[PDB]
Design an enzyme around this catalytic site. Structure first.
Site, mmCIF file in Angstrom:
data_model
loop_
_atom_site.group_PDB
_atom_site.id
_atom_site.type_symbol
_atom_site.label_atom_id
_atom_site.label_comp_id
_atom_site.label_asym_id
_atom_site.label_seq_id
_atom_site.Cartn_x
_atom_site.Cartn_y
_atom_site.Cartn_z
ATOM 1 N N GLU A 1 28.426 10.231 -8.488
ATOM 2 C CA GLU A 1 29.323 9.119 -8.896
ATOM 3 C C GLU A 1 28.576 7.781 -9.192
ATOM 4 O OE1 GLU A 1 32.997 7.279 -8.320
ATOM 5 O OE2 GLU A 1 33.684 8.679 -9.860
ATOM 6 N N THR B 1 3.611 -11.989 -0.207
ATOM 7 C CA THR B 1 3.135 -10.955 -1.152
ATOM 8 C C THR B 1 1.671 -10.695 -0.980
ATOM 9 O OG1 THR B 1 2.978 -12.797 -2.657
ATOM 10 C CG2 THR B 1 4.692 -11.195 -3.144
ATOM 11 N N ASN C 1 16.310 -9.257 6.670
ATOM 12 C CA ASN C 1 16.658 -7.871 6.751
ATOM 13 C C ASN C 1 18.098 -7.620 7.103
ATOM 14 O OD1 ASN C 1 14.027 -7.581 6.162
ATOM 15 N ND2 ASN C 1 13.500 -6.390 8.025
ATOM 16 N N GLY D 1 0.798 -1.217 0.000
ATOM 17 C CA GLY D 1 0.000 0.000 0.000
ATOM 18 C C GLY D 1 0.818 1.247 0.000
ATOM 19 N N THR D 2 1.389 1.527 1.141
ATOM 20 C CA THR D 2 2.079 2.790 1.260
ATOM 21 C C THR D 2 3.476 2.802 0.596
ATOM 22 O OG1 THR D 2 3.398 3.151 3.301
ATOM 23 C CG2 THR D 2 1.226 2.237 3.599
HETATM 24 N N1 GTP Z 1 12.582 -7.967 2.886
HETATM 25 C C1 GTP Z 1 11.481 -7.496 3.434
HETATM 26 N N2 GTP Z 1 10.323 -7.398 2.699
HETATM 27 C C2 GTP Z 1 9.203 -6.890 3.259
HETATM 28 C C3 GTP Z 1 9.211 -6.471 4.588
HETATM 29 N N3 GTP Z 1 7.973 -6.017 4.900
HETATM 30 C C4 GTP Z 1 7.199 -6.137 3.794
HETATM 31 N N4 GTP Z 1 7.942 -6.675 2.770
HETATM 32 C C5 GTP Z 1 7.504 -6.967 1.384
HETATM 33 O O1 GTP Z 1 6.907 -5.826 0.736
HETATM 34 C C6 GTP Z 1 5.598 -6.140 0.283
HETATM 35 C C7 GTP Z 1 4.531 -5.537 1.221
HETATM 36 O O2 GTP Z 1 4.766 -4.149 1.425
HETATM 37 P P1 GTP Z 1 4.578 -3.389 2.847
HETATM 38 O O3 GTP Z 1 5.714 -2.370 3.065
HETATM 39 O O4 GTP Z 1 4.334 -4.364 3.934
HETATM 40 O O5 GTP Z 1 3.210 -2.587 2.702
HETATM 41 P P2 GTP Z 1 3.049 -1.043 3.128
HETATM 42 O O6 GTP Z 1 1.666 -0.423 2.686
HETATM 43 O O7 GTP Z 1 4.254 -0.415 2.513
HETATM 44 O O8 GTP Z 1 3.157 -1.181 4.747
HETATM 45 P P3 GTP Z 1 1.807 -1.251 5.662
HETATM 46 O O9 GTP Z 1 1.101 0.109 5.706
HETATM 47 O O10 GTP Z 1 2.233 -1.653 7.048
HETATM 48 O O11 GTP Z 1 0.726 -2.121 4.930
HETATM 49 C C8 GTP Z 1 5.558 -7.675 0.233
HETATM 50 O O12 GTP Z 1 6.004 -8.135 -1.039
HETATM 51 C C9 GTP Z 1 6.517 -8.131 1.322
HETATM 52 O O13 GTP Z 1 7.185 -9.320 0.975
HETATM 53 C C10 GTP Z 1 10.390 -6.592 5.332
HETATM 54 O O14 GTP Z 1 10.418 -6.243 6.516
HETATM 55 N N5 GTP Z 1 11.524 -7.113 4.746
HETATM 56 C C1 LOC Z 2 -7.517 -12.155 9.547
HETATM 57 O O1 LOC Z 2 -6.482 -11.573 8.750
HETATM 58 C C2 LOC Z 2 -6.135 -11.852 7.432
HETATM 59 C C3 LOC Z 2 -5.729 -10.787 6.630
HETATM 60 C C4 LOC Z 2 -5.341 -10.968 5.310
HETATM 61 C C5 LOC Z 2 -5.361 -12.308 4.753
HETATM 62 C C6 LOC Z 2 -5.763 -13.335 5.566
HETATM 63 O O2 LOC Z 2 -5.767 -14.581 5.063
HETATM 64 C C7 LOC Z 2 -4.610 -15.355 5.387
HETATM 65 C C8 LOC Z 2 -6.137 -13.125 6.890
HETATM 66 O O3 LOC Z 2 -6.551 -14.163 7.676
HETATM 67 C C9 LOC Z 2 -7.943 -14.526 7.713
HETATM 68 C C10 LOC Z 2 -4.903 -12.421 3.340
HETATM 69 C C11 LOC Z 2 -5.517 -12.905 2.432
HETATM 70 C C12 LOC Z 2 -5.566 -13.191 1.343
HETATM 71 C C13 LOC Z 2 -5.050 -13.241 0.248
HETATM 72 O O4 LOC Z 2 -5.617 -13.880 -0.926
HETATM 73 C C14 LOC Z 2 -5.112 -15.143 -1.356
HETATM 74 C C15 LOC Z 2 -3.754 -12.579 0.338
HETATM 75 O O5 LOC Z 2 -3.082 -12.513 -0.670
HETATM 76 C C16 LOC Z 2 -3.221 -12.007 1.621
HETATM 77 C C17 LOC Z 2 -3.704 -11.959 2.906
HETATM 78 C C18 LOC Z 2 -2.841 -11.300 3.937
HETATM 79 N N1 LOC Z 2 -1.426 -11.073 3.632
HETATM 80 C C19 LOC Z 2 -0.428 -11.980 3.660
HETATM 81 C C20 LOC Z 2 0.933 -11.445 3.329
HETATM 82 O O6 LOC Z 2 -0.494 -13.179 3.895
HETATM 83 C C21 LOC Z 2 -3.387 -9.892 4.129
HETATM 84 C C22 LOC Z 2 -4.896 -9.835 4.413
HETATM 85 MG MG MG Z 3 0.085 -1.018 3.006
#
Ligand code: GTP
Ligand code: LOC
Ligand code: MG
Ligand code: TZT
Ligand code: GTP
Ligand code: LOC
Ligand code: GDP
Ligand code: GDP
Ligand code: MG
Lengths: 124, 419, 427, 421, 419
Positions: free
Chosen positions: C244, C169, C218, C134-135
């Site tokens: 550079e 993801t 990380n 998202g962000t």
């Molecule tokens: N290597 C690494 N990848 C991350 C990490 N956190 C999230 N990701 C990856 O980045 C993607 C998700 O992005 P986020 O930064 O969690 O989402 P965001 O909107 O930027 O953060 P939130 O507002 O907390 O939802 C996914 O593909 C994750 O695998 C991290 O701590 N380390």
């Molecule tokens: C209660 O909180 C839940 C919240 C979410 C998910 C979910 O199912 C495991 C949850 O449990 C019920 C979730 C769902 C679905 C997805 O679709 C396959 C996805 O890509 C991704 C997700 C979740 N994200 C991840 C990285 O696993 C985010 C939203």
């Molecule tokens: Mg986000």
């Protein structure tokens, strides 16, 4: 490999250098749109000023169908009060000068019964 | 980040009473009292379901709605009866009807405000409220009727926020009542429009689940009610605990629904009743195990999510899931890339040192909808008991709008078996 | 000569969080910010005693940023430099760039402005963000738009986490990636991608960590990130300033995407083995196995290479290493280019996190490469997008927050263009 | 949640009289009204000690109402709840609805008003009346007209005694029946017919009472009446609630007429299944007719006593697969089953024995219009010569009221047949 | 609910004296005194015929009217002579005439008021008076003349209430005049107009009953009078006893008379003189047994009622009656559905542990009326003795109005043998 090394930058706590190895071969930003930042903001105040006065809609149909009900029970009341006033009167009228229709049997065989003892008075 | 909770009527209320009797357990809350649990995590997200109060004490975020005292006095006495804010109770005093109109319009509206007025004070007094979830019978009156409305009323006083429902879609077996088809058909139209995610809990599935596999001869409204209760548990979970994802529940919604048509999820559970992990998957993904009476087969999956519970390594979980989709390749959609996500949480439920719960957005659910739109026109056919609602102040063709909409929905489900 | 880190959203943050942790260890600053070369590149010697990072942190939900002002390092940062935004972006670029971005953008921008107000000739920005999510996609993208206005020249370097199936993801991901990339691109000067999958694969293999934490991954990235910025914290030739970087990695203004291989990654408890030969580390740089974006250049062609050695090392050898790759591996440079190799030696030995999983080394290389086969990675993202979008997949969720059906179009447009430019630099 | 009984005219009264007798024994209230669940549905805990029924009794001649305030239970009722009208209705509807009703109608209506005045949300009426018979057809009809006004929603349930040749009728009977039915109809929500003949037939056969009393028949009906109202008297978490039992029984706003089979009737001096299996029984019906002839549209079993759903469902199963099923064209094949743990209490002196469990089968079947015809045919062929018509035209009626009622009758007779397939 | 009783003249009076001597017996009343009877029932309906008085004592509801002292002084002395309130006696002092005019017009009217004034005080002093019944000769003067009038006078001062008469329709075989045909025809017209039910007691039948079956040689006005007496008994009965029906007598009326034309019933009795039950029916339903000289055969029944007396089971009664109508199907009308009703009472009469009495509205009675409208025009085919009434102050054609009305009646009885 067979190297030749170009020298670039020897420095207090590090070094640099190239190692060219084989010759090569041959040959705005706009401040503008924070205005489109306002475009989204725009088409969501609409998006929602839809489902809104669309749900302000899906009410006062509600307030309507509530009334089209009480408003349809009142129909059943001042429809069937007169199914009773014009019955418990199409009745007490149908009889009250109709049982007295049975008294033109009586003040008749009476104004004749007197009427021929007036025939007995016909011996004077 | 914070969520208030609505329970409405006979089924909506009993479903929740056994929902709160479980989550209150896993966090560790006495009937009234605050904490007692040799764990520690718990209280991270206790926030999300518990607006807390005087002393230490924990009072759930709970709005209790019914149109007859009945089932509500059944909760103040019994389970964790003490737990809910006694001012979060809304009695109806009059009839329910078992008729959707009374619930959505006449005897309904009548109350709405005084529940609307309470969801407000509770939500408008959270701190970054995330959404509402509400439970209810889908045929029958108060729950189904007043509910549909309440959520139709919630939207608007909250656009913005997301709508979550557990709906017990009702069946011929386990409860007659010549009518539900109507109430349900009417509400299904209604959900499809107002909510963002709904969980179809088919009673038919539920009691067929205590029978075809469980040999519980005369199933209580209890056990079976106990099934939903534990499915409610695991469906939340990452909502209420973890350290994995973080789950806006909007984060859920926006990921499990490609198509605006709030698609209705069919749930299902791990170890059933009252565990190898392979053997816990092929159970969870088995049709005899789904809380909605459909064989996901005639009907492929769009998106699936599964959350596992207890002491077990995500080594076999990774590759058992990333397995199922190969010994069943063509039954998950081709065109949604990584559409089956798993999550691991390690704090056990009721008994059970191991438990999976499963959420599937599957066009197999078309099967569940068709069949009620058919008990429907098998009545609305020769304009059946319609008169109970003609008379309540409803129009003849307001049934045709919702048969003509429920059929539209069944059609999308169908359309989406594509290129 | 003054250098500001911006970390945006979960990934952005956590990645950063745990590599300022390493910068500190490297420069020997205690958590409270006090300490008993110049490295002013990245800290301001504010007041008497304390050091403070030249950083901002922006997430739209507390949680992550929160546990920063929670976990020792509590002290490092000034109250104000961590910005946090009440409501999550929910995994979608619409929200970030438009709906919820709009809110916090104007504050953020003012706080970066502040750390620069106090820099006699700031030279750049190290933006740290996720590819999907998202962000991470959205705010970044909004940010980088604006920064390009307020700071025209001044380099923007992005470090990007290209996401992968198994470091988790989420369906919509692919949308967001394709999405930001397009916007960000004509604003960002150079960009180091980081395949989550690659990193995760390094741990599973080289460290034996069976199911790796974020924190597990990380750290690795921490090392790598240091090993880049290294240059411009100690001063000693090559990537001394940010300019550079272009000079040395991008031949072609399309923000190009360098690939980082990293030296020895070897699990402590191995620590005490025979440290490896100057040559050997090098030789694992030319290694699929040791890449940092899943792909391969026995497949693609080079156009810019560049070795970053850390520790006690001597040129004489660095050479006779380079020497027997020239006649031991796939040389492989583009029709019209030297066969470069700007080498960066930094005498400062590679410091590592005591708790951690890796062992103290003696020297470590770092190979930055611009290769055409990095567009292997552009395709795997595109294909997802293309086939989801092939049914509007989830598109509405964006059209909702205010986006256009045709913004999705006119980004994938751009994507197919780049995908060609890259293939279009092949003989 | 509060529930008023009205009994009107000889039958109405006597039927009621002897089933408040049963209510009391059931709820264990002693005659004087005192006693050592909720059952407040039907009684007001008035003052300290006494209980008083939620009832009115109206007859136009004393006698019947009179031997109420005569025979222990003297005490039960308040002096004012029994209304009585000096002059009989003489077996004719003109009188009841018009001539002599007029007089007492306004007082009656005030006294029901008084028992409702004291009910925080009254919910209905149980009107008890004869089909033929002066005041039973007539006053009832007048009553229900007025009640519909003063209490629009509030349900009216009528219990009707459809009359028969040998529990004695009277020539003009048929007129009166056809007559009230028509008026009453668009005012009454649901109506339970009771074939006197059927009842009488049950006694002669199952009890051996060769020539049965009113009080003989009346006990039987008492039991049946209880077992219906049973529902809303006490609770028992398993079901109860007529409210939404009706729901099934009346598909179609024409006041429909359910048919009451009753469980075991066995003379003082059986398996869960067996009792059930005698519900689907011509012999054990409660209006002379039959549904191997007509089609069902609403079914509904009312079990009483110690019973288990285990036992109830496996008896229901094989009812659908060796018997004549009979569910019309377009219905669920329902069966709203209701269990009331409380065991079936019976009158000590009476002719029936203590049971353990008793079923009650309420059915809306099309063949109940077998009973509408047998009434119509009598009417049609009497009227075919003005029969007695004048006796009504006298009291103030119309030649065309008799028409425009038989009108309606022929319509309903078709509706019923018109729910064919 | 209450009924006052009129007796007028020679026959009307003697008939009642032997009516009161029987009912007073069955209740158990001394000449004066109140009760003496080892039964208990009795006093339920004693109300209906006994306005009670000083001490305990029982005094009948009885108005006694005659136009010569004679037959009234014959009752004060004799039977239960004491019993009637001595102010309930109205003497006439002058002639009766044996001529209908004197009775209805001149010497009649003269008295009417002072009996109208008494029926008032006794009726207007009942409490829910139900009707009057009166007895009388139908040929002859005072009874028939003053009677017709009294009832023509009662109507009007009471519309409302119903009119009941026992009328002794007089015959050639056993009578004291040649004129009766006149008096009767004049009165029959008069009844047909004023009353609601009348009982035709044919004297022809009565004496033919003491002869063709009884061999009773020279029959007194005594016996033969005794027959009517016990027929009066069983015709009331349910009026004055039971626990079966309750009998408004209007309830009777409105059920036994399809047609406004007060159709005259022909009575008849069970065991005759001075008993298996089968043999009690075929007796009661036999023509040799009817108190009106007709053979119910040439003439079907409209409606019939029978009341049985004494302990015998309504098992055989039910099916003996519901028998007669099969071994005689076509002699009860087709179109009046259940037009034969039976009532059982179990307290015996004179002797007799068994007794049925029978009331039939039969067009067989046409036969009885035709024959008097024939003695008539065999004499009004002459202005025969007419001069006794021409002279009294009556018109010639006021006879033709009642011949011309008596013929109309005979014509309806006829017309009704229909489809
Ligand atoms: N290597 C690494 N990848 C991350 C990490 N956190 C999230 N990701 C990856 O980045 C993607 C998700 O992005 P986020 O930064 O969690 O989402 P965001 O909107 O930027 O953060 P939130 O507002 O907390 O939802 C996914 O593909 C994750 O695998 C991290 O701590 N380390
Ligand atoms: C209660 O909180 C839940 C919240 C979410 C998910 C979910 O199912 C495991 C949850 O449990 C019920 C979730 C769902 C679905 C997805 O679709 C396959 C996805 O890509 C991704 C997700 C979740 N994200 C991840 C990285 O696993 C985010 C939203
Ligand atoms: Mg986000
Ligand atoms: C479909 C209902 C079903 C679950 C139960 C029954 C009803 C019930 O609610 N029970 C059993 C006793 C108490 C209660 C529950 O036990 C744990 C429990 C108290 C509960 O959660 N109750 C809901 C709250 C409530 C309280 C007070 C009033 C109303 C509601 O549960 C056993 N039941 C009677 C039936 O199923 C019955 N169903 C049928 O007969 C058939 C079906 C099943 C084919 N009919 C529909 C025709 C029986 C015969 C099998
Ligand atoms: N089952 C039963 N039927 C009765 C009873 N009393 C009368 N009936 C029937 O009802 C019809 C007569 O109606 P009634 O109630 O007696 O007449 P009513 O005008 O209402 O009452 P009254 O004023 O006393 O004449 C006949 O069909 C009888 O068979 C009774 O006590 N029990
Ligand atoms: C004295 O009181 C009597 C009163 C009545 C009847 C009667 O004859 C048996 C009486 O005895 C002489 C009566 C009459 C006639 C009927 O017509 C066949 C009828 O259906 C019905 C009846 C009586 N009703 C019943 C149910 O038998 C009511 C009126
Ligand atoms: N599983 C479950 N379903 C129920 C329960 N109660 C009712 N139902 C179902 O929902 C329908 C009626 O619901 P109900 O709760 O009575 O509606 P309400 O009056 O609005 O509360 C029935 O047909 C049942 O199938 C419950 O206890 N649990
Ligand atoms: N059965 C009976 N009939 C009588 C009696 N007295 C007179 N009649 C009949 O009635 C006719 C005249 O009646 P009567 O009483 O003398 O007339 P009244 O002068 O008006 O009282 C006669 O022809 C008889 O047939 C009586 O004692 N019993
Ligand atoms: Mg009556």
């Amino acid at each position: 490999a067979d190297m030749e090394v170009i020298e670039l930058n020897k420095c207090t706590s590090g070094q640099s250098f190239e190692v060219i190895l084989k010759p090569p071969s041959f040959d705005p930003s706009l401040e503008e749109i924070q205005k489109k930042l306002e475009a989204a903001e725009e088409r969501r105040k609409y998006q929602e000023a839809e489902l809104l006065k669309h749900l302000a809609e899906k009410r006062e149909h509600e307030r309507e169908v509530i009334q089209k009900a009480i408003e349809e029970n009142n129909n059943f009341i001042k429809m069937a009060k007169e199914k009773l006033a014009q019955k418990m009167e199409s009745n007490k009228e149908n009889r009250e000068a109709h049982l007295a229709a049975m008294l033109e049997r009586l003040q008749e065989k009476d104004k004749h019964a007197e009427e021929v003892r007036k025939n007995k008075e016909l011996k004077e | 980040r914070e969520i208030v909770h609505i329970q409405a009527g006979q089924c909506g209320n009993q479903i929740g009473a056994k929902f709160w009797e479980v989550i209150s357990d896993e966090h560790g809350i006495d009937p009234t009292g605050s904490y007692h649990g040799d764990s520690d995590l718990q209280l991270e997200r206790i926030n999300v379901y518990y607006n807390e109060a005087t002393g230490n004490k924990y009072v759930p975020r709970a709005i209790l709605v019914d149109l007859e005292p009945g089932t509500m006095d059944s909760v103040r006495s019994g389970p964790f009866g003490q737990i809910f804010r006694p001012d979060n109770f809304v009695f109806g005093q009059s009839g329910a009807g078992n008729n959707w109109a009374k619930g959505h319009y006449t005897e309904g509206a009548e109350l709405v405000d005084s529940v609307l007025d309470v969801v407000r004070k509770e939500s408008e007094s959270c701190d970054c409220l995330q959404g509402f979830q509400l439970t209810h019978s889908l045929g029958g009156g108060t729950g189904s009727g007043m509910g549909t409305l309440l959520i139709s009323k919630i939207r608007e006083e909250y656009p913005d926020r997301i709508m979550n429902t557990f709906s017990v879609m009702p069946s011929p077996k386990v409860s007659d009542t010549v009518v539900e088809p109507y109430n349900a058909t009417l509400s299904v139209h209604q959900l499809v429009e107002n909510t963002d995610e709904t969980y179809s809990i088919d009673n038919e599935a539920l009691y067929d689940i205590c029978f075809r596999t469980l040999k519980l001869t005369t199933p209580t409204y209890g056990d079976l009610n106990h099934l939903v209760s534990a499915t409610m548990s695991g469906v939340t979970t990452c909502l209420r605990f973890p350290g994995q994802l973080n789950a806006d529940l909007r984060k859920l919604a926006v990921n499990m629904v490609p198509f605006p048509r709030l698609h209705f999820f069919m749930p299902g559970f791990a170890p059933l009743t009252s565990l190898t992990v392979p053997e816990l998957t092929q159970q969870m993904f088995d049709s005899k195990n789904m809380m909605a009476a459909c064989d996901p087969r005639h009907g492929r999956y769009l998106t699936v999510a599964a959350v596992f519970r207890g002491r077990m390594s995500m080594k076999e979980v990774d590759e058992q899931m990333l397995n199922v989709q190969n010994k069943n390749s063509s039954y998950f959609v081709e065109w949604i890339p990584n559409n089956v996500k798993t999550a691991v949480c390690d704090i056990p439920p009721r008994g059970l040192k191991m438990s999976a719960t499963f959420i599937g957005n599957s066009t197999a659910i078309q099967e569940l909808f068709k069949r009620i739109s058919e008990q429907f026109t098998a009545m609305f056919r020769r304009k059946a008991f319609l008169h109970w609602y003609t008379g309540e102040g409803m129009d003849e063709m307001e049934f045709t709008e919702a048969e003509s909409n429920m059929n539209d929905l069944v059609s999308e489900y169908q359309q989406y078996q594509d290129a | 000569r003054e250098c500001i880190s911006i970390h945006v959203g979960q990934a952005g943050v956590q990645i950063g969080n745990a590599c300022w942790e390493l910068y500190c260890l490297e420069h020997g600053i205690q958590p409270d910010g006090q300490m008993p070369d110049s490295f002013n590149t990245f800290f301001s010697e504010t007041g008497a005693g304390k050091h403070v990072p030249r950083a901002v942190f922006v997430d739209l939900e507390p949680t992550v940023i929160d546990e920063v002002r929670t976990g020792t390092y509590r002290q490092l940062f000034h109250p104000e430099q961590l910005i946090s935004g009440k409501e999550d972006a929910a995994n979608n670029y619409a929200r970030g760039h438009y709906t919820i971005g709009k809110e916090i953008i104007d504050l953020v921008l003012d706080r970066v402005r502040k750390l620069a107000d106090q820099c006699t000739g700031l030279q750049g920005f190290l933006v740290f963000h996720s590819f999907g999510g998202g962000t991470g996609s959205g705010f970044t993208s909004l940010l980088m738009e604006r920064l390009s206005v307020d700071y025209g020249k001044k380099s923007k370097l992005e470090f990007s986490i290209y996401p992968a199936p198994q470091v988790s993801t989420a369906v919509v991901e692919p949308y967001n990636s394709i999405l930001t990339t397009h916007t960000t691109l004509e604003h960002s000067d150079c960009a180091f991608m980081v395949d989550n999958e690659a990193i995760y694969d390094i741990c599973r293999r080289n460290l034996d960590i069976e199911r790796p934490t974020y924190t597990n991954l990380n750290r690795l990235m921490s090392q790598i990130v240091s090993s880049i910025t290294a240059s411009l914290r100690f001063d000693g030739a090559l990537n001394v300033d940010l300019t550079e970087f272009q000079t040395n990695l991008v031949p072609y203004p399309r923000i190009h995407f360098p690939l980082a291989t990293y030296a020895p990654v070897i699990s402590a408890e191995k620590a005490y083995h025979e440290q490896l030969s100057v040559a050997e580390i090098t030789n694992a740089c030319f290694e699929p196995a040791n890449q940092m974006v899943k792909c391969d250049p026995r497949h693609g062609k080079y156009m810019a290479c560049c070795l970053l050695y850390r520790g006690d090392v001597v040129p004489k050898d660095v050479n006779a290493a380079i020497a027997t790759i020239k006649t031991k591996r796939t040389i492989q440079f583009v029709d019209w280019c030297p066969t470069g190799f700007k080498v960066g030696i930094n005498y400062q030995p590679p410091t590592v996190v005591p708790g951690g999983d890796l062992a103290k080394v003696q020297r470590a290389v770092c190979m930055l490469s611009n290769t055409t086969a990095v567009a292997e990675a552009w395709a795997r993202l595109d294909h997802k997008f293309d086939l989801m979008y092939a049914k509007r997949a989830f598109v509405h969720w964006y059209v909702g927050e205010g986006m256009e059906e045709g913004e999705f179009s006119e980004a994938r447009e751009d994507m197919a263009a780049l995908e060609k430019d890259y293939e279009e630099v092949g003989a």
